[PDB]
């Protein structure tokens, strides 16, 4: 069934990808689907490679999946991740704003604070939180990047150009767009909050649970709700900024090997899915969190035939992005 050149971003993913290829080869029959690893510096390069036919697949955050659709790459979502459980799969998750208990400020008081973002253009770490604070931001608001750097008093927005918007890398100099940046991603934005570099971390509802196994430690943290109040991390369903589409694997539209990508992932979630193997795991890793696929994922679901990004993502979230990228006050 040929090979799916998987795009790994940086060395940790590269390692897990190499492990993914070995283990798959050790079980799936010589005729089945195999995996190859193409290592890139950022998801941006991953998107260029796939569109150039030097790679075939990569998993992306909804917001990045939207971007991958715009020309001249026009990549399509082919396999989505689902969370929660296999019995009740959820193809969405909750963006939340985590903070340290007794920090003393609600949502309408973020101005002047320090922000820890998962990454620029990501749903929970950027599109959702910045969309909601769009008008609180100082004018001019365009370019957005600079208005955000001005609203807060120091941030970490991975993938942002540190040369044009220095304050966006104040909490993580260089704004590295990969695990090389320790404050990159969910658990990265959380560590930025925990080490005390920032005051708030825009991540997902499961992030803190992936980092603090003891409730005692977690009680020293809270969520900022939309009604300008705070609630425990356990109460995200009623204290989140928004609900968003699940991360999804994207591929080319022509000669995209979507059937093979899915066949590879479906067989892979049976062999190495949640609690399935003692040799290898798809949704966890000894080299780091959320490498290739997010840790909170429980499996995969095949995206309907020929579906494009707009359709998959859905109108509500597409609008949310269009509004943030346009919108007025
Ligand atoms: Fe995300
Ligand atoms: K500022």
UniProtKB/Swiss-Prot annotation:
Disulfide bond residue pairs: 7-46, 17-37, 116-192, 135-329, 156-172, 159-177, 169-175, 225-239
Residues modified to Dimethylated arginine: 21
Domain of life: Eukaryota
Residues annotated to bind hydrogencarbonate 1: 118, 122, 124-125
Annotated Fe(3+) 1 binding sites: 61, 93, 186, 247
UniProt note: domains: Has a bilobed structure, each lobe binds a single Fe(3+) ion. Does not always bind 2 Fe(3+) ions.
Family (UniProt): Belongs to the transferrin family.
Role played: Transferrins are iron binding transport proteins which can bind two Fe(3+) ions in association with the binding of an anion, usually bicarbonate. It is responsible for the transport of iron from sites of absorption and heme degradation to those of storage and utilization. Serum transferrin may also have a further role in stimulating cell proliferation.
Name of the protein described by the UniProt record: Serotransferrin
Naturally occurring in which organism (per UniProt): Homo sapiens (Human)
Encoding gene (name): TF
